[PDB]
Symmetry: C2
């Protein structure tokens, strides 16, 4: 197992899923050579369907029916709150309806944006978006500071921001939202190289 493989992913997946994956794969296969690209939903799609990427690590959301997928993991959406948020202190899951009138910090990084918007709609409201960011950490930092609440698909292991403030992570109820999977994907009509076949098999074992 040797050769070039080009791997893309969403920015939100880069610091959460990718480091351990790339480190472990590359250690297992010293002669493999990985080109790593992070890009937006539309750009990765263009690249992956163009032959620029072998494989892409994406949320299993708004995905072309022509892409093959294999689950890597799956995670419920969570609410994240500042320590002194009115709702940070109550035990159990939060009814998302109870945040309808608290200012939201929207992570607008498609496909996360419409997923958040749909989850709020199933809880029966349109959020007051006080601040918008495409940056995962900016959303977390704004929240830990007390600028609003947010909905996130992934959970950094330590509940603290770049500023050194805590964040409080809550499950969601009424309804309990669907689990969102992260997936390795490729186009149906791609011929997987050996290094690519080896990558998909390793990172999912």
């Amino acid at each position: 197992v040797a050769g070039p493989i080009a791997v893309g992913c969403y920015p939100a997946l880069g610091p959460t899923i990718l480091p351990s994956m790339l480190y472990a794969f590359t250690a297992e296969y010293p002669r493999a050579s990985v080109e790593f690209r992070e890009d937006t939903q539309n750009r990765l799609r263009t690249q992956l369907e163009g032959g620029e990427l072998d494989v892409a690590i994406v949320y299993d959301l708004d995905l072309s029916p022509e892409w093959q997928t294999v689950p890597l993991m799956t995670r419920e959406p969570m609410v994240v709150l500042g320590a002194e948020h009115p709702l940070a202190g109550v035990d159990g899951p939060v009814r998302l309806a109870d945040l309808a009138e608290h200012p939201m910090v929207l992570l607008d990084a498609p496909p996360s944006t419409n997923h958040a918007m749909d989850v709020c709609r199933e809880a029966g409201f349109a959020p007051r978006v006080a601040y918008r960011t495409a940056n995962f950490e900016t959303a977390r930092a704004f929240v830990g500071r007390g600028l609003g609440w947010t909905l996130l698909l992934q959970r950094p292991r330590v509940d603290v921001t770049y500023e050194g403030l805590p964040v409080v992570v809550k499950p969601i109820a009424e309804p309990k939202p669907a689990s969102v999977a992260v997936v390795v994907a490729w186009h149906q009509e791609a011929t997987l190289s050996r290094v690519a076949r080896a990558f998909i098999r390793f990172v999912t074992a």
Copy 2:
């Protein structure tokens, strides 16, 4: 003071500098409203020139002379290593020259990208870039996992990545790299509003 202000910044400044600034400002002036936008280098300049932004929080690197600036803080570039890194035992500062042959994780987020190539260039080398990302946490997470070394202009308060791994931050010497100012900026020819002026005075107080 009351009314809208549009504040832009570079994404890496969004979670580190901006959260407390926006919190403190909106706390002093409950009737001001901030329109917050993170944007890449040309796009922020382009928005500021056209009046879409009142002010920008930026690194003072490669800025137009048309912009008035006031320094908020200054920071030395630093090397960031994973805990198992060959040079992580190095007591005291690293000479960057000592990492010339180790793989680098490059934060490609102008103006950081040219700054970083500029500081290696000055230590005598062109780095071997194993991985490139415009995402700050992706750079820290990759380095914490062992995928290479980086250099960064800012330092999150807790030396831990999203995977819960530590990062080891070291000063650079021989030569010591140039410090970089973070500034509040606005265009020379703008007619500043009362709220924009209040913002500038408030963050430079």
